[PDB]
Design a binder for these strands. Sequence first.
RNA 1: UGGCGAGAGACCGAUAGCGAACAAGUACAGUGAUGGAAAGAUGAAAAGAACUUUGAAAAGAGAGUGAAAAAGUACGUGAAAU
RNA 2: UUCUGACGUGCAAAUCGAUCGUCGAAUUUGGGUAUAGGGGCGAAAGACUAAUCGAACCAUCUAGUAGCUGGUUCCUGCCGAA
RNA 3: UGGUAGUAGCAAAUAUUCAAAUGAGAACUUUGAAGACUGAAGUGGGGAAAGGUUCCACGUCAACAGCAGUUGGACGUGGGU
RNA 4: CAGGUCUCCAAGGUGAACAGCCUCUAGUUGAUAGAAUAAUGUAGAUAAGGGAAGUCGGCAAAAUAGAUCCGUAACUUCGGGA
RNA 5: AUGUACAACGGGGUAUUGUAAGCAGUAGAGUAGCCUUGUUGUUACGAUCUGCUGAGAUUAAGCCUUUGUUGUCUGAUUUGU
Lengths: 102, 50, 109, 87
Amino acid sequence: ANLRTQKRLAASVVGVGKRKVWLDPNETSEIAQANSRNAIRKLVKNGTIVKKAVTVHSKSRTRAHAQSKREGRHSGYGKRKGTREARLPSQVVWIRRLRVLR
Amino acid sequence: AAQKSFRIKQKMAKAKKQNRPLPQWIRLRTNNTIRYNAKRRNWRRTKMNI
Amino acid sequence: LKDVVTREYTINLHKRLHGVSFKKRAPRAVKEIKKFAKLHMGTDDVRLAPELNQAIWKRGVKGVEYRLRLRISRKRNEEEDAKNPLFSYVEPVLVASAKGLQTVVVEED
Amino acid sequence: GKGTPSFGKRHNKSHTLCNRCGRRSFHVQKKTCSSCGYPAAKTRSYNWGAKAKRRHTTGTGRMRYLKHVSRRFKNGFQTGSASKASA
RNA sequence: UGGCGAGAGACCGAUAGCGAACAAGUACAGUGAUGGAAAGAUGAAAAGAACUUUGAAAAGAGAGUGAAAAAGUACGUGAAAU
RNA sequence: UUCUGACGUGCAAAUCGAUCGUCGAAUUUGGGUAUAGGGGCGAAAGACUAAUCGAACCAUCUAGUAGCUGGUUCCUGCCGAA
RNA sequence: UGGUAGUAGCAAAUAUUCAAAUGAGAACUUUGAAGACUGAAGUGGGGAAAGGUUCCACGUCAACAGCAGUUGGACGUGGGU
RNA sequence: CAGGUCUCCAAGGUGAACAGCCUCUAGUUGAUAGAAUAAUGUAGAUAAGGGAAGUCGGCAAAAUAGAUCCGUAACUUCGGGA
RNA sequence: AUGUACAACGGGGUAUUGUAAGCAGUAGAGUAGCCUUGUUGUUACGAUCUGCUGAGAUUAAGCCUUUGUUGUCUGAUUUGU
């Protein structure tokens, strides 16, 4: 059929946007009948429309790189592109040098 | 516009109720020359200028 | 008269997707596999498979592999038939390295 | 720059509907209509606008009262009612 | 040369006559003052095409109404360019 | 700014691309409001005043006037220039 | 109304592919499977000015969407603040 | 109609950074297609040796460029020049 | 159109880059952990190095060659003194 309204209603009902719902292609005649939001809540509950869980953005290489920066690595001059008073300003270091002594 | 006075909306009500074709039964009526509606104002063609 | 033959192949895509623009290679892989199955089985209605479609597009437009193992089945058509009573149906098969394999007639039992 | 990218910037109104003549010629900053002249107590028409008088004179509207005046002259401005004669 | 009610013509006959023979100061254009069209005529009468067949449908082909569809609601005669 | 690149019966009655000015203040801008035609406004180019400006648009006077340009509708006959 | 001419051309914005469903007819509709893009000074969510019903649903494919069309900010009928 | 039109929200990595580059939530996949891939174009490139000899003119490209450390002339309004 | 034919693969040669993946190692700057605390004392971490590895990958789309495997091989149209 023409399932534009069903995908829009399913995105509004489940709450996840239109790019992640899964109107299954086998039961399409059934989804041609479900025209209201109360019928979308039936077709989500039994498993005819599901949620299609989130694509993984692994912050794991990030953790390995930050762990290596904690170890002292990855901080030469060819990983250092801002000035010395822009990476960490001298006024910050001075406040730390003098809120401690005072 | 999206937040209106009343007078402009009143004229939109008239501009809605005029935006329709002929009744189908007038074309059978005796001594008729009116074959269509020569005042169909669309929104993509003619702005009504309020 | 029966002609329900199912075979397997290696298609060499490097000698067919050579020198093509990069944003056209994988659709030309598709249009080329249809021409391949037209060449071999002889029918002119070729259906691919979405498994085979994924197997071409594993690496975007410009990363189609060099050799592929196809499995072409020349099935007979029915049900308000098209202009030929037979059609090809082209699946992939899973192999580790597609280099080295000849053509094989698949027995159906 | 003086053409289509300065017809982009053109999204206000200098005129609104006149209450008197209803024609949308009511200038907002001057607070006076430019077609009929509202709220001046007269209606602006000029003798160089030969067509403008042809658009705004009597008989172009309903004639909600004058339509009945000449007829009411023909009978001599009668008052009261008529009687019943026969049949 | 305005309004109403009248009578007329060695006038115009729809590119003419008023801008307007028609839902004409209308459709429409312009911020506005203002500018402003085009567009009449099937037949006596819709009798405006039942029914069959081809086609998915528009339509065609038969059939039929009509003096006549070389009058079919893109409709009087229907020129020239093409 | 430059390419005097693209385009130049265009995407566009002035845009596209790279390059380039400036980027915290004589900055940029929405809305309201003030100033209007020989007047407005101008860090002045006769620039801008709704694609119109060494003087806007609209209507009327107005069919302005022209010693200047273009056109000036059927035949035959008799005479015929400068 | 022509010849021009079925020519000029419909080339900026990295980009599409496979199978199924509807159908007379799917490069373009719908679903699914991939592949990519904007990459949060977004091709995302709200609005002001402006438009006025375009919002939403059922049906239809003459005209419009400078290709197509069973799709549509179109057409027909209703609903909605 | 590849123009123009005011504002709010604001993720992860590199990175000084709201730069560019890649992904998450979100939204699209729309801008006529198919086949070949001649000339001449538009857009991007790369060139042996020489090096502006081209040309009105190094116009167009190329080359440098981030950070860290050293070193920094004439002139000067003694701030700069850098 | 039944052929020491042709095609799709596979094999061999030629060629291009340059030594793969995986497994192992009294190689490895050092760093910790331990114990009989050593006269390589070991276990773990450790870019890289060595060994199988002139390996692996590509090789015709306009390279060469082939008895291997699987196939294909008459569809349409016109023409006479």
